[PDB]
Symmetry: C3
Subunit: 74 residues, 3 copies
């Protein structure tokens, strides 16, 4: 199915962008150290990112499950 | 259908990833402001593609709704 | 169909998102190259996913086009 094949493509790109995104956050934090933010000034910022990250992994997780289920049924 | 349902998750991922990215964007500009390089142009690129993404996410929400109301 | 138009929407949302990512990587590079460095591996990691994402994107473009020409 070209439609089902496209979903897989979109999901994949999203997963790859998630790595890229996590690589960019890491890079940003390294800069933050050397530099200097305000001591704890970025705590909530960091917290918000972990919230989205966790949500994202969750969604990707459900999507991968839905992907296998759409490939057998549809 | 499982396709529309999944497309919803994909969209929420894109949206969550988008918000995540915007946080990265804010942080970087904070960093740059605490410091050459021609950053106003970069500023322009950010804004443009930020506009574009917002437009795309909004239109995806609209279609998602239309699809969930049709399938 | 509404489905194929949604994939067209999601694909572009991903394309646009890719630019912001590359731009944020860019700014990071300028700042990092201003302030050894465990970055050598960060750079290798970046290039890898960038190429993969551009590969996934164009692949999706090929698919998007094919699905639309058959009116799915």
């Amino acid at each position: 199915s070209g439609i089902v094949q496209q979903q897989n493509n979109l999901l994949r790109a999203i997963e790859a962008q998630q790595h890229l995104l996590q690589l960019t956050v890491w890079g940003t934090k390294q800069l933050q150290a050397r530099l200097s933010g305000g001591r704890g000034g970025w705590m909530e910022w960091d917290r918000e990112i972990n919230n989205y990250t966790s949500l994202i992994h969750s969604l990707i997780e459900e999507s991968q499950n839905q992907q296998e289920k759409n490939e057998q049924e549809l």
